[PDB]
Structure 1
Amino acid sequence: TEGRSRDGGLRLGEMERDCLIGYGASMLLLERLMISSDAFEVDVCGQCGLLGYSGWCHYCKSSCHVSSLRIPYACKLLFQELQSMNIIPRLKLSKYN
């Protein structure tokens, strides 16, 4: 949350993000903005590139190409809002190697 009365946390604003980028602490910036703030694990289908649930893709009615992925909850909300706006982001996953 925002306020202290409602038990709110501090905000790493755009200026803080810029300072971290200038420093180059990539892992620090990641742990701050992704791990410790809005960390979440979603399920994405490798066939259609849509978001699934419980390792199941309702679009293709299959669960072989569905895989877990770490993603910020804010980014997931943005993807959902775009899909509602009809701007469908098709995520093409691949191995980390």
Structure 2
Amino acid sequence: TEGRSRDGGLRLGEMERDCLIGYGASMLLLERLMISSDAFEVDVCGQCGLLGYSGWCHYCKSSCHVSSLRIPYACKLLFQELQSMNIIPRLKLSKYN
């Protein structure tokens, strides 16, 4: 939340985002902007490259090609609205080696 009547927590405005890039740090800005702001987990079906739920791809009627993945909530919301406009991001994933 934002206010002081409501609870707060300050903003990492875009100028700070550059500052953190500047030093050359990498986990710090990941932590500040994903672990402790809107950390969230989803699942996707690798065959169709689109998100599902509970390890069950409603599109494919299967549970084999599903996988779980961590993603900022605001990014998940972005995928939904874009799909809502029929602009479907069919994301592609692989092993993390």
Name the SS for the 2:89 alignment partner. strand
- In 1, the alpha carbon distance for the partners of 2:81 and 2:24 equals 31
1:4 aligned to 2:4? yes
Q: Which structure 2 segments of 5+ residues have no match?
A: none
RMSD between superposed Cα atoms in Å: 0.8
Deviation at 1:89, TM superposition (A): 0.8
Aligned residue in 2 for 1:41: 41
Structure 1's consecutive aligned runs of 4 or more residues displaced over 3 angstroms after TM superposition are none
After the TM superposition, which residues 1-97 of structure 1 pair with which residues of structure 2 at under 5 Å, given as runs?
A: 1-97=1-97
Q: Unaligned regions of 5+ residues in structure 1, if any?
A: none
Q: Percent identity at matched positions?
A: 100
**How many residues get paired?**
97
Instruction: Quote the offset at 1:86 in angstroms.
Output: 1.1
Per the TM alignment, residue 54 of structure 1 is displaced from its structure 2 partner at its CA by 0.6
- SS of residue matched to 2:94: strand
